[PDB]
Amino acid sequence: KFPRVKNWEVGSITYDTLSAQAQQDGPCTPRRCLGSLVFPAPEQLLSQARDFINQYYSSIKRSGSQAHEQRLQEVEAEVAATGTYQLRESELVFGAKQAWRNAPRCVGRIQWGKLQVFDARDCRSAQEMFTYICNHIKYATNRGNLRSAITVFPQRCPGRGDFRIWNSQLVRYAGYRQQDGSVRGDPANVEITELCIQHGWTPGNGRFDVLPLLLQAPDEPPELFLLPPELVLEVPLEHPTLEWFAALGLRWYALPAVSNMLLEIGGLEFPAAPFSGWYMSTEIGTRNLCDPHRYNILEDVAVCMDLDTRTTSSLWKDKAAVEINVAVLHSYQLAKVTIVDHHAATASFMKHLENEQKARGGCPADWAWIVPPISGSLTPVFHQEMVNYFLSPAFRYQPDPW
Amino acid sequence: FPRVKNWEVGSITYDTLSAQAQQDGPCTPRRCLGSLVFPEQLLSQARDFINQYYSSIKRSGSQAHEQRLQEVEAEVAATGTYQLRESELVFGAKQAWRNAPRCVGRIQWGKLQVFDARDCRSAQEMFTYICNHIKYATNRGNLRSAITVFPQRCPGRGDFRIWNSQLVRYAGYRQQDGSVRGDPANVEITELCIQHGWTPGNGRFDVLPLLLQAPDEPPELFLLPPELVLEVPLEHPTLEWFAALGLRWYALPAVSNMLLEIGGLEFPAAPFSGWYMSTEIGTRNLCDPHRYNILEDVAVCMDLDTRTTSSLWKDKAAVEINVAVLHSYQLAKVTIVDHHAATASFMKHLENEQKARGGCPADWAWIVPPISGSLTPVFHQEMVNYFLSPAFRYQPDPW
Ligand code: HEM
Ligand code: HEM
Ligand SMILES: Cc1cc(N)nc(COc2cc(CCN(C)C)cc(F)c2F)c1
Ligand SMILES: Cc1cc(N)nc(COc2cc(CCN(C)C)cc(F)c2F)c1
Ligand SMILES: C[C@H](O)[C@H](O)[C@H]1CNc2nc(N)[nH]c(=O)c2N1
Ligand SMILES: C[C@H](O)[C@H](O)[C@H]1CNc2nc(N)[nH]c(=O)c2N1
Ligand SMILES: [Ca+2]
Ligand SMILES: [Ca+2]
Ligand SMILES: [Cl-]
Ligand SMILES: [Cl-]
Ligand SMILES: [Gd]
Ligand SMILES: [Gd]
Ligand SMILES: [Zn+2]
Fold it and tell me: Where does (6R)-L-erythro-5,6,7,8-tetrahydrobiopterin bind (chain B)?
């Protein structure tokens, strides 16, 4: 049999048949589960390529056609001659969508079919790379009506270095390692900040300074490019009823654009391929502003709210964190920037799981990452058993280039 | 040896104890299933537990050690099973708690009152042992941990089984509109009680009778005297209408349907109890959609905007229900603990166990509280889950 999966809210029971097609192995064994850990050749390339091609031809309802036979024979010939092959434009668009669709830790996959794919495979310098990224930022921001996008730079090939974007996201705020061990800014960005300074950037002293980009073109040190300020839409934060909240000086940016993951399609690897969507408010409200090792504002909000912070049993932390989340959502809706709260987000993911059960017979989901960081059991994904496994195409983590 | 990181702090440790995992869990390299709720060779298991026991008391390979080994050998040669000494039984009971991966309260594991009930026959004796337990553990609101071990399983004989999933359960009555009045979780046991001859109440908080089962007999209904079942009426420190909703819960969480395993012995009835973490009552029992599901009622009462999700009315209402649970238990002087204090104590347990055994089996999904996840330190702690023995285990229903 296949793993039987159960929804404890409704009683319903599914079987995940898709999980049998899992190739690459994860970190668990029958002796011990490591699900909570954040970070866990001509003939193998051929079998990956064959699998991907079969996938494309299934998607377009054409499996076994003449064009399917021929494209498989085409790919086989190019690998035999060059050791690699090239994706057709239509295969790249399909592959980027499949990689998103396959990402077990993404709760926003109800959208996986509405992804704009920018083909940058003919890029040949850091300067051209920057222009592709600004065009992406502009397209995806769209003055606050966010559109999902991905730009795909050239694939890894033997005898030439990779394109890399050094920044983990296109928009990040500086983190200045202060002298008393502290940090002014986003602590998560202290390393990439010190790297920007070392590469010529004149730093500021704010807590919300936008970092420039370090772009690495093949076989060359990274180059610094400053984003034009009019390109980075930002939301100042205010509370619908806590007027002093505005005085806190809080901002976040509109566009979540992950730039450091590797995209893998049919055996081919794209080291630089930034992708963006829109934010779920709990990423900003709970994790980015309340994580103790981030901006860590939970106590200061609670004190201002005049909460009794001397005993945990008053639940001051939970009260302040709710209200920080209200402010984020209210602020994005005020400035007409797309945003979704963790109730709608998780309820649309329940809709995605059910589409996927029908479409494919399963859905890779990492329960610990799909359940939001506040109000977990209040969302319906909490009560949904999930099966976690690796399908390809895929987005994968990769080493820092320095 | 799995590297385990804490992300708020940056500390690394190594779990060397996972190597001692005796049994197998549900996960494989192809797929992780940790989110799933329910995933004469007796000599080998008995020998291992003994080596454990004597190592724990610093008397390994000594005289008493080898004496007990040949003792159990001959006991199973003569009988087919063997008897635990009272001290080993105490030790196994504590170890099985200490090894429970889904329990956040294990900071307490050394302090547990073990009541030996292996000399029990008939359900009326069962019932007497059980009321002594409730009396000892409740202790007028100052709660104390306790377990009562009933006769082990042996060949050719029935088992002792407590049919109720807990010693204290509220009725769930199916209604002609389909819905349930009372606790929907308990609909199945509530008809079993009515079938074996219980007079149904009709409130949302009617305490069920006990369906106790002595070997090779049908179960017998027993009613708990109301003065023994201590209950907390729920009120809110500042929202004066909350009291009128009539919500209540009980004081003693007493699980009565898990099987206890020690040195290859199996105890199908060994009820244990502790005290409650507030979120168990406030969030899961009163607010799960398939339990009392009171969240919208409370939101309406708070005049929140319940027609749009982004007002976070579900979150604001949930917090205030937890606030009322905490305030009501403390006011009535019943032991309770909030999820912040509980998760910080589990962090201390992790450090202590890192030093005592080199690791600690922990099931992240059940350690992290169901509200305010990332607001507690366990959210940022990587965790390894595996099955040591002695253990507590789920087991099929008695029917
Ligand atoms: C359009 C709305 C989207 C929403 C609301 C959304 C939401 C999220 C959230 C909340 C996470 C977990 C983030 C974390 O805590 O680390 C996540 C992870 C992820 N998302 Fe999505 N996302 C969206 C679009 C996209 C797109 C367009 C892609 C790729 C084409 C994508 C790919 C991924 C991947 C690969 C991860 C896993 C990385 C990790 O471990 O954090 N998402 N997403
Ligand atoms: C004394 C304070 C205690 C606290 C605060 C506490 C807390 C908890 C909580 C919150 C859970 C998760 C329950 C759930 O929602 O599924 C749990 C599970 C568990 N606890 Fe504890 N507990 C305590 C005492 C005990 C004792 C005395 C024992 C046995 C001697 C024990 C053994 C277990 C076991 C076996 C589980 C697993 C049950 C399951 O899978 O749900 N606990 N505990
Ligand atoms: C496209 C997109 C949309 C969206 N709404 N959210 C995301 C979040 O994606 C990531 C976020 C982090 C930050 C780590 N987190 C603990 C704060 C690390 C990653 F590797 C990610 F892929 C991506
Ligand atoms: C001794 C003790 C103390 C304590 N504070 N909490 C517990 C909770 O124990 C269990 C709870 C559930 C219900 C799981 N969820 C529906 C709430 C199922 C089980 F099998 C359990 F053992 C036990
Ligand atoms: C240790 C733990 O696995 C880790 O903190 C995970 C848990 N779940 C998460 N879930 C999301 N969405 N994002 C995260 O960063 C994490 N962190
Ligand atoms: C599907 C998921 O495994 C299931 O809902 C689990 C998750 N975490 C939990 N955590 C606790 N404390 N209690 C539970 O019942 C559960 N249920
Ligand atoms: Ca070609
Ligand atoms: Ca009818
Ligand atoms: Cl982010
Ligand atoms: Cl309970
Ligand atoms: Gd105000
Ligand atoms: Gd009113
Ligand atoms: Zn696992």
Answer: 35, 284, 365-366, 379
Same domain, B132 and B218: yes
A378/B2 CB distance under 8 A? no
Chain B residue with CA closest to A341: the answer is B310
Closest CA to B96 of B35, B147, B24: B147
Locate the DSSP E strands across A233-388. 234-236, 251-253, 257-258, 262-265, 268-270, 275-276
Asked if A377's CB is within 8 angstroms of B373's CB, the reply is no
Atom of ligand 6 nearest to the CA of A386: 1
State the catalytic residue, choosing from B280, B287, B313, B360: B280
Helix (H) or strand (E) segment spanning residue A357 = helix A342-359
Whether ligand 1 lies within 6 angstroms of the CB of A263 is answered as no
What lies within 8 Å, CB to CB, of B323 at 6+ separation is: A314, A315, B236, B237
Q: Are residues B327 and B203 in the same domain?
A: no
Tell me the residue type at B123. Answer: A
Question: How many domains does chain B contain in total?
Answer: 3
Residues of chain A contacting B289 with CB distance shorter than 8 Å = 9, 380, 383
Domain-embedded: residue B385: no
- Which DSSP letter does residue B352 get? H
Q: Is A313 on the interface with B (CB under 8 A)?
A: yes
Task: Give the CATH number, domain containing residue B302.
Answer: 3.90.1230.10
Q: Is A395 annotated as a binding residue?
A: no
- Resolution value (Å, 1 decimal): 2.2
Tell me how long chain B is.
Answer: 399
Please confirm, yes or no, whether B287 is among the known catalytic residues. Answer: no
Domain that holds residue B91: 15-118+145-155+259-273+343-367
* Residue B163 designated active-site: no
Query: Which residue stretches of chain B are H helix?
Result: 42-56, 63-79, 86-98, 123-138, 187-195, 278-279, 286-287, 295-301, 313-331, 339-356, 364-367
The helix/strand/coil state of A348 is helix
- Of A2, A7, A97, A26, the closest CA to residue A56 belongs to A97
